[PDB]
Amino acid sequence: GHMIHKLADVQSKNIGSGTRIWQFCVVLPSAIIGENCNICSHCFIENDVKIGNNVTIKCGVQIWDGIEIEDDVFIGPNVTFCNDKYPRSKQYPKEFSKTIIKKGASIGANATILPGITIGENAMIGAGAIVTKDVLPHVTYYSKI
Amino acid sequence: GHMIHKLADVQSKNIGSGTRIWQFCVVLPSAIIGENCNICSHCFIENDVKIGNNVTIKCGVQIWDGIEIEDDVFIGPNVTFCNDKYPRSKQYPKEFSKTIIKKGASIGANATILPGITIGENAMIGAGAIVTKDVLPHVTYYSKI
Amino acid sequence: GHMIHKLADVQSKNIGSGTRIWQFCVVLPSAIIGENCNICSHCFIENDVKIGNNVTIKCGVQIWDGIEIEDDVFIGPNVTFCNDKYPRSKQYPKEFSKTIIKKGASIGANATILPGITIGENAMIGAGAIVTKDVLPHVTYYSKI
Ligand SMILES: CC(C)(COP(=O)(O)OP(=O)(O)OC[C@H]1O[C@@H](n2cnc3c(N)ncnc32)[C@H](O)[C@@H]1OP(=O)(O)O)[C@@H](O)C(=O)NCCC(=O)NCCS
Ligand SMILES: CC(C)(COP(=O)(O)OP(=O)(O)OC[C@H]1O[C@@H](n2cnc3c(N)ncnc32)[C@H](O)[C@@H]1OP(=O)(O)O)[C@@H](O)C(=O)NCCC(=O)NCCS
Ligand SMILES: CC(C)(COP(=O)(O)OP(=O)(O)OC[C@H]1O[C@@H](n2cnc3c(N)ncnc32)[C@H](O)[C@@H]1OP(=O)(O)O)[C@@H](O)C(=O)NCCC(=O)NCCS
Ligand SMILES: CC(=O)N[C@H]1[C@@H](O)[C@@H](C)O[C@H](OP(=O)(O)OP(=O)(O)OC[C@H]2O[C@@H](n3cc(C)c(=O)[nH]c3=O)C[C@@H]2O)[C@@H]1O
Ligand SMILES: CC(=O)N[C@H]1[C@@H](O)[C@@H](C)O[C@H](OP(=O)(O)OP(=O)(O)OC[C@H]2O[C@@H](n3cc(C)c(=O)[nH]c3=O)C[C@@H]2O)[C@@H]1O
Ligand SMILES: CC(=O)N[C@H]1[C@@H](O)[C@@H](C)O[C@H](OP(=O)(O)OP(=O)(O)OC[C@H]2O[C@@H](n3cc(C)c(=O)[nH]c3=O)C[C@@H]2O)[C@@H]1O
Ligand code: NA
Ligand code: NA
Ligand code: NA
């Protein structure tokens, strides 16, 4: 089976064997999470969400509607995603922009992923990076400081 | 009335009709929150705080003493604010620096708002931006990467 | 004694007099926390962790295995740390990289601290900074925007 912490609010039944979901996580009903994932404390996971097997999501991350995470992905702490390029309060998109983080990619701590983004297989996103364009497979990207 | 999630700690009675406050939020007694707001999971809202109507605060945001949010503002996930330009542990300011986010402005995911800042009506702050100076009304600002 | 909020999960007994640990914090058993600390809501503190006296950790911060915080340090909200320079899901380091934040240093809101980093005594890290190199004692560092 899987481990859902008593201090998490997990509403999805679509959770793979070996997955751990930690304290103060919210997971909404339609989320799909594969096997042997680690969803660390203080994460939010919405409905139109697919997360593969062996995915690590460190603390303080939100996976919105329109975000897909493939197998073997690492997401660092306080990483953000997004599904709305020009957000205005109460102006709901007719269709959320999709992001996909492809198999084996890693996203460093506190990176910011713009909407509509593909990060290729086995890419490495530097800590604190702002990703405004697709990142090719196996590429190391970071923002110049 | 308003919706306070059972897994939130909301101590303020000053909350407008239609407002939703989600799991694992903390709202301290003197906070004022208007009507039809959405305070998403994992937010902290302090005492000397005014939030208008139709405000969206996405997950993982803290609204400190000295921060005012006007009507129709969008605040993206993991956005930070601040009320102390030269912070030192246990050195409490005599007066917190004030920030105001004016009506209809939007702040992108993981943006950082320095203390003493005005963001003008209907401004758009890019995801991951560091805002060290006021942003004029209706201006799109982002940090060069 | 110390104050552990009923809505925190604090598993460590190694907590100094006068320390406050707030709602929705997780503190694992081996963490050491000194006297008169303030661990604000939504923090995660791991096992191989030493935090000194009079330390302020604002909301939304994680202190990982391998991180030491000395006395009188201020850590701003949504700051990230890290102990793995080339993270890949399920590829556990044989030894976590160590970070030390030396006495009296301050780290601004939403800063990102790379692994293996020393921040010197009384340094000041700008809000949103990415710290990829040691910061000398008493130096003010920020990332060019
Ligand atoms: C991107 C990364 C993999 C690069 O490592 P690297 O290729 O060994 O690069 P180097 O350390 O040799 O740095 C090369 C240059 O890039 C800069 N740089 C490295 N990482 C950077 C980052 N994340 N953001 C901005 N600049 C960065 C360095 O300052 C250095 O600049 P210089 O040549 O002017 O001295 C690494 O720095 C990183 O960000 N890792 C992610 C860590 C993380 O978040 N892990 C999960 C949580 S623990
Ligand atoms: C700022 C923003 C509105 C700009 O959109 P835009 O005006 O269409 O700009 P473009 O996509 O045409 O990009 C123009 C340039 O600015 C850069 N840029 C855009 N947004 C940026 C950002 N947030 N930070 C740094 N650079 C950015 C692009 O890389 C591009 O560079 P180039 O000309 O060298 O190719 C948008 O990118 C953004 O950040 N939106 C906020 C999304 C968000 O956080 N929503 C809430 C959560 S879903
Ligand atoms: C770094 C800091 C201490 C510098 O303050 P300062 O020395 O008075 O510097 P100034 O305000 O005079 O700014 C000098 C320049 O650096 C830039 N700058 C200042 N802080 C910056 C930051 N954090 N990131 C990027 N640039 C910054 C300014 O835009 C200004 O640029 P300019 O000369 O082109 O106009 C302050 O800006 C800061 O970041 N404080 C931390 C606030 C915080 O996070 N507190 C805890 C939460 S409330
Ligand atoms: C800083 C960082 O992200 N480093 C990671 C990287 O090196 C990576 C390759 O391995 C580790 O990440 P994992 O999440 O896979 O660690 P693991 O040892 O499987 O699980 C411990 C994590 O679980 C989460 N957790 C654990 C417990 C016991 C808890 O109560 N609440 C909880 O949220 C957070 C812990 O860091 C490291 O933490
Ligand atoms: C990524 C992003 O910020 N996009 C937003 C933007 O497009 C914006 C214009 O609309 C949406 O934001 P809202 O917060 O207004 O969404 P809404 O549909 O009103 O409410 C769903 C949000 O409520 C919060 N929520 C919801 C539930 C059911 C919950 O259990 N816990 C909870 O925290 C987080 C959800 O994303 C989008 O999420
Ligand atoms: C924006 C910022 O970090 N500014 C700080 C800086 O000026 C610094 C020098 O002083 C203050 O930080 P402290 O954390 O030391 O504030 P303090 O007055 O001791 O405690 C209030 C904080 O405690 C935390 N807290 C408090 C209560 C009552 C709670 O329910 N849940 C809780 O998480 C968050 C509050 O901001 C300021 O908040
Ligand atoms: Na819009
Ligand atoms: Na000070
Ligand atoms: Na590795």
Residue B119: CB partners within 8 Å, gap ≥ 6? B100, B101, B102, B105, B107, B113, B125, B131, B134, B135
Tally of domains in chain B: 1
d(C-alpha C6, C-alpha A26), whole Å: 19
CA nearest neighbour of A70 among A37, A26, A27, A112: A37
Q: Which of A142, A143, A144, A145 to mutate to test the pocket of ligand 1 (most atoms within 8 A of CB)?
A: A142
> Nearest ligand to the C-alpha of residue B110?
2
What's the angle, vertex CA B80, arms to CA B77 and CA B85, rounded to 5? 170
Chain A to chain B, count of Cβ pairs less than 8 Å apart?
79
Question: Which residues have C-beta under 5 Å from ligand 9, the single-atom ion?
Answer: C 86, 88, 91
Which of helix, strand or coil describes residue A74?
strand
Cα of first residue to Cα of last residue in chain C, in angstroms, is 44
The CATH number assigned to the domain holding C111 equals: 2.160.10.10
Paired strand residues for A56 = A38, A74
CA distances (Å), origin B130, targets A135, C16, C42, C89, C117? 23, 36, 23, 30, 22
d(C-alpha C105, C-alpha C124), whole Å: 6
Distance of CA C37 to the CA centre of its chain: 12
Q: What DSSP character marks residue A88?
A: -
d(C-alpha C19, C-alpha C40), whole Å: 11
Question: Which residues have C-beta under 5 Å from ligand 8, the single-atom ion?
Answer: B 86, 88, 91
Paired strand residues for C4 = C21
**Which residues of chain C make contact with A56, given a CB cutoff of 8 A?**
87, 89-90
CA nearest neighbour of B30 among B16, B17, B46: B46
For the beta sheet containing B118-119, the strands, ordered from the edge strand earlier in sequence to the opposite edge, are B32-33, B49-51, B67-69, B99-101, B118-119
CA distances (Å), origin B39, targets A22, A92, B59, B74? 22, 16, 8, 11
Range of the structural domain that residue B142 is part of? 1-145
B85 is written with which tokens? Answer: 């330009």
C133 is written with which tokens? Answer: 């190199």
Q: How long, in residues, is chain B?
A: 145
Ligand 5 geometric centre to CA of C120 (Å): 40
Which of helix, strand or coil describes residue A4?
strand
DSSP E strand boundaries for B17-117: 20-21, 26-27, 32-33, 38-39, 44-45, 49-51, 56-57, 62-63, 67-69, 74-75, 99-101, 106-107, 112-113
SS (H, E, C) chain C: CCEECCCCEECCCCECCCCEECCCCEECCCCEECCCCEECCCCEECCCEEECCCCEECCCCEECCCEEECCCCEECCCCECCCCCCCCCCCCCCCCCCEEECCCCEECCCCEECCCCEECCCCEECCCCEECCCECCCCEECCCC
**Which residues of chain A make contact with C88, given a CB cutoff of 8 A?**
72, 74, 104, 106
**Which of C36, C40, C41, C80 is most worth mutating to test chain B (most B CB atoms within 10 A of its CB)?**
C41
Distance of CA B38 to the CA centre of its chain: 12
d(C-alpha A33, C-alpha C45), whole Å: 25
